[PDB]
Amino acid sequence: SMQLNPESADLRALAKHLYDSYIKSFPLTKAKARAILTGKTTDKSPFVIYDMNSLMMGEDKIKFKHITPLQEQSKEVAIRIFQGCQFRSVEAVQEITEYAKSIPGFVNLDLNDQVTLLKYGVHEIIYTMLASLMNKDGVLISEGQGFMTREFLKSLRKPFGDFMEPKFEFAVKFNALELDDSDLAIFIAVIILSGDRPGLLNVKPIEDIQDNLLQALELQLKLNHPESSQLFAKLLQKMTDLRQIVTEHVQLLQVIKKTETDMSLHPLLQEIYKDLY
Ligand SMILES: Cc1cccc(Nc2cc(Cl)nc(SCC(=O)O)n2)c1C
Ligand SMILES: Cc1cccc(Nc2cc(Cl)nc(SCC(=O)O)n2)c1C
């Protein structure tokens, strides 16, 4: 029963606002990532980390632009990589917080509700957007300057061997839906504005902003994806798949925390993981 009415013109306005915010908040878009991954970019090729030699040439070659002290550099490779991944996760939180602030209504929520949403949301968003940086062979790192191979990550000693494999498995299947940035901007807004995160004070306001975002998503997918009538339903099942991947990630992080008692976990990520339980 799709129609051009004042309601649909607004859902199109909401969609455009989210996209523009998204472009402002995330320097590496899916559009840019795909261009690099396929070679079609006019940018210089990323440096490829496929083994321990290229890892060390790459750590010399790639502009990571956040000093590792002479304490972490002393660390073995698997922990060095994990700590890099940790630093990038914290950045992604920063980027995602900025984006969620652009979501109409978000800032007018109670500041503690704004904090809860992000704390239980960010990791679902990180795995969503991580898929944009992944193909079957590997993942773009350091903002598209680098490419680390799936098999090189699998070669790391236990339990560092497994931490990315599930996100690759989620990505290959998510990426087959062929979402673009304009789709992802609404999909991400929907996730962040989840009413059923524990310890929110004001639930109905968040649900009201969401059901709106969801209508905008459904209209967007119908306009943007004539090839599927199933795509909205499939994306709702992805939202459920993502909570599981986050559950299984925490399991892994405990096995790390309680057998690698040496190594540092970023206190902000410790803050987030506290109550995923
Ligand atoms: C702070 C710093 C500087 C230079 C190299 C590294 N180690 C690495 C190595 C690799 Cl292959 N990947 C990373 S983080 C990857 C990412 O940016 O997603 N970090 C680190 C942890
Ligand atoms: C965008 C990007 C690229 C490469 C790595 C990461 N961070 C990840 C990805 C995965 Cl599969 N696992 C981790 S372990 C660190 C953590 O979130 O505790 N951190 C991120 C967020």
- DSSP states of 93-126 as a string? HHHHHHHHHTSTTGGGS-HHHHHHHHHHHHHHHH
Is-contact 147 46, C-beta < 8 A? yes
Q: What is the resolution of this structure in A?
A: 2.1
In single-letter form, the type of residue at position 106 comes to F
Q: Which ligand is located closest to the Cα atom of residue 146?
A: 1
Q: How many Å apart are CA 158 and CA 259, to the nearest integer? A: 10
Q: If we measure between CA atoms, which residue out of 275, 183, 196 comes closest to residue 240?
A: 196
Q: How many Å apart are CA 56 and CA 49, to the nearest integer? A: 9
Q: Which ligand is located closest to the Cα atom of residue 149?
A: 1
| Angle at which helices 231-257 and 181-192 cross, to 10° | 60
Q: Pairing between strand 138-141 and 146-149?
A: antiparallel
Based on the structure, what is the number of domains in the chain? Answer: 1
Cα dist. 40→7, 43, 55, 176, 178 in Å?
39, 9, 25, 19, 17
* Residue from 59, 76, 90 whose mutation best tests the ligand 1 pocket (most atoms within 8 A of CB): 59
Beta bridge partners of 140: 147
**CA 89 to ligand 2 center in whole angstroms:** 5
Q: How many Å apart are CA 149 and CA 134, to the nearest integer? A: 10
Tokens 């639930």 label which residue?
A: 203
Q: Does ligand 2 lie within 6 Å of residue 265's CB atom? A: no
**R_g over Cα of the chain:** 19
Q: 159 preceded by cis ω (within 30°)?
A: yes
Tokens 């004001």 label which residue?
A: 202
Method used to determine the 3D structure: X-ray
| Angle at which helices 111-130 and 77-101 cross, to 10° | 130
Containing 140, the helix (H) or strand (E) segment is strand 138-141
* Residue from 26, 126, 140, 141 whose mutation best tests the ligand 1 pocket (most atoms within 8 A of CB): 141
Structural domain of 213: 1-277
Query: What is the token pair recorded at 81?
Result: 């990589």
Is-contact 17 106, C-beta < 8 A? no
Q: How many Å apart are CA 49 and CA 17, to the nearest integer? A: 37
